[model samples]
Target: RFHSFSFYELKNVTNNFDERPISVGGNKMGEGGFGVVYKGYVNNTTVAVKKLAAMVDITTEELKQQFDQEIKVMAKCQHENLVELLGFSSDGDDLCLVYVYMPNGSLLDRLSCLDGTPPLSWHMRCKIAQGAANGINFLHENHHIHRDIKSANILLDEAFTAKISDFGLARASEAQTVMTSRIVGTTAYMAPEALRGEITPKSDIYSFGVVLLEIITGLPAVDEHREPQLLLDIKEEIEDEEKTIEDYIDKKMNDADSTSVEAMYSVASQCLHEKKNKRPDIKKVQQLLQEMT
Candidate 1:
């Protein structure tokens, strides 16, 4: 049922990419290595459109293949916590992708507490973490590795439901492992093994752990040094008697639920373990998160 559409139809549906173009003062959702994302209307319904850059690293032929690949991957897999791909359009060298709009924006945006956005409640954070874990578990079950798992790729709906997005770097695993010389993905969220050109399902679990750390502390995955100081330095703070865990909790979450916070920290600690084999599977992570909720 999934297929491509004409540039004319895409132009009409997205107001020639002007419903909310990514100009200097336009409705820009966010910028990524791939391209700029914008919000728009199609069939009188809201959608998010990703317009690939003209200088994209991949060739036009590869672009077409990726478009087909993304459509096939997303169409075959449907989960409450996985963002849905609507369709796609290509006009000569330009490529655009359509996705179901998520009104609440990204977890990264909300984590900042910027633009008057309220901090997520403890219960909401727990729910989001659990949902994201479920989405990753589903992907792994289908042999897909979400090479990039970070706060920015986790979108939130109006009801605060979390969905995994940006499958451009995803790949299917062979024999539970995927070796790549390319070493794609955000450095801050990348597993140590990934830094050395080794990729496996555990790599994603490590990235998800960084996201979990972000959710817990409401801090960026990395600081100016591009190092996850919070994750690497917080366990001691969380356990020190003189310094309460409250000191490490997000300032905006004045009343963070202690039970859930403790549970998540334990899971996050396990996820950050240096040994790939030591990390818990996503399903185990999801079960623990669900228990917290």
Candidate 2:
């Protein structure tokens, strides 16, 4: 019932779904309800392709409609800070989505960079935050909620530009209860409301706050090997504003810019305010980052 050549295009781009060519893999980004991702090299430029496994069905007209909706949603979004959706294809039984490849990979990979390998300076972290805010703003304005926003979802190109990806679980506010029934998204980054099966644009804001916490603390949301407690306990550990940021940064930043660290931590605290309404809007968050430079 579906078209042919267009369907096979995804296969061509993915080299017949060979796992070797795929490179960037993250806890959340690569593992989605839709499929696994692979870095594709073409014309000396890298592109990320999400190859939906054979198990997931996109064949029936009903399933096709679902796929079309995702494409339509992505097609409407156009912003420098957001991941660009290049094109999509469905081959007989296979489907794929082509996106602008991120050469630097993800903020996850960047954060995992060796201590001396282009250390994440205060300015770089601010830039990443600002860029991500711009992308989130665009999504909200378009009437869609990213539903999943995190350091892993943040992608970086050669110039280190950041973009948000992974719309597989994204749904419009009107469809949130209907389209995405089960609670989705990473637990560590899950907004308080999202964990309760309710979501709003503010939910994305909360996730972003978690990411900001990750950036400032240079720690993952949870770590089993952290001697006794995990990083999320930072909330309980950092009861006092002034001491929390001062004490918990990564050791790589042994002699970091003290003033910059202080200011960044202050903003991160504000973003993570317990009350969702109390958190800064993405637009406001963008402005805060802008004022930093």
Candidate 3:
């Protein structure tokens, strides 16, 4: 059901490349060096389209290849927990990647929203975390490193199933003994060594741990609103959890499943270990989730 198409076809489908008139929905999601994201629609179906801006000294070909790799990667991936790539189109210098709508939006969206939605119940939150962890496990099994893993990148479909999105930052590592690349993922979710320019399968595990922590806490990794005692840096925070974890567990989850939460929280704490060697690999992580069900 997914394949690449001519840029002109997409233009006609969306109507003369009008950015405003035809876009059925638009929500400013986030911004970074790559660019900003907006939840929009095409054919009345919600889609997230990123407008990648020109960066200094990078060739057009290089930029194209980056997305080209993403297209190839998603086309090859088929999983219940992965965001579907509807298609991709490039017009002149502009490029857009179309993805299946995520109606529940992102975990980060719910965390930051003023209202309109109920807080995530503890069991539901753990299930979302488990789904996302499984998704990353799938990616690693397929020999790809997501490179970026965060609440914003974790999407929920209409059924409220969590799907891991964004492969633009990924690179293949199937046959290699090691990954030899620059550190490119978000610093907040990045592993300690990744910040020092070392990237590996463990890097994804580390990022997943941070994302798992966010799920448990329902708090942003870096928020100034919380008090200094409550706000945490990765190592110190994960090292001395208990207090912060108890403080931020989504209230909705209060009556859900105590036994499950306690067990999963224990695993999450283990994953958040400062030493990468201590963290379970994605394979082990998946097995842990399977045991929960």
Candidate 4:
């Protein structure tokens, strides 16, 4: 289902993995997503190649396992919302994974509305939520669990349509906490069951619940400065009348609709329940988000 790229082929195409942009006098292209990837064109297709960090904490064997597991799953899972894996290369520790390059960058960066970017409009954010739920719902339909579900993993296109990134293979179920957590994702977005290695579809929903908070509040899941009150902790504040749901919406979204935003919070609340069974199914969440958008 995917190509097994040769080291020579990639070496020529990526211009030695250069990072500069063509506008700034370098041929290297693309500015969004993680900096680990190099933008290049091969066979008329633009791609981003993610090079594994050379100084990884895992041993060669563990890295190999992670690679194979990722490749194995990537090749099987295919959907519009999932980032397409075009190929991979493992020529003498110069390991890499190639994906379709996305120019708009990741949702995490857009949420921050960082330098030279504007905050996403309420309707666009709603659409991103809809598209992401579509991707996660597809994963669940096939019995796949994206252990890492966060704004960072939700990518956007030029049209702002959302696609999920890094969905397969590496997991806490196989490597245990230390090694798994080292490579998996942020601890703040991890579900209770996932943290304990009791992974399930519900656990993925829980993580998405956290992601929903990120979408609605434009706040990081965990920040030392926000001590004693993370984004999720705001649930209590909203419930007790200490703060209205609108009070927590991204300060920039002043034009947001009260009705739609309230419904969005309701959907997130269903997903954030401490009890796994209480969490709604991905299909339901997708349907709810679809309606909101």
What is the number of backbone collisions in each predicted candidate, taken in the order shown? 0, 2, 3, 0
lDDT (10s digit) by residue, model 4, range 250-287: 98776688899899999999998888878899999998
Q: Number of the top candidate by TM-score?
A: 1
Better of 1 and 2 by lDDT: 1
Model 3 per-residue lDDT tens digits across residues 184-204: 766777777777776567878
User: Among all windows of ten consecutive residues in candidate 4, which has the lowest summed lDDT?
Assistant: 170-179
C-alpha TM-score for every candidate: 0.89, 0.82, 0.82, 0.86
Per-residue CA lDDT of candidate 1, range 1-293, in tens? 55476677666655566634344446567768776777777777788888776344655565566666677679778999999888877767778888889988899989996566888987788889989999999999998888889999999999999999988777787655556767678887888898888878899998998898889888887677644354545655555665655567787776677877878888988898778999999989988887776
* Worst 10-residue lDDT window, candidate 3: 17-26
| List of clashing residue pairs for candidate 1 | none
lDDT of 2 by residue, 1-293 (tens): 22223644445555655664233332113544457776564455566777665345434454455567667777787789888777766756756677777767778767767323465766677778888888988888787888888888898877778888877666676533432456767787876777878767778887887788777777776677783244545665677443566677766554467676666666666677767779887788777777766
Q: Candidate 2 deviates by what RMSD?
A: 4.6
- Cα shift from native, residue 263, model 4 (Å): 0.5
Model 3 bad stretches (over 4 Å)? 1-32, 38-44, 54-62, 175-181, 227-244, 256-258
Off by over 4 Å in 2: 1-9, 21-33, 42-45, 54-66, 114-118, 173-180, 227-230, 240-243, 253-255
Q: How large an RMSD does model 4 have? A: 3.9
Local distance difference test, each candidate: 0.80, 0.69, 0.69, 0.76
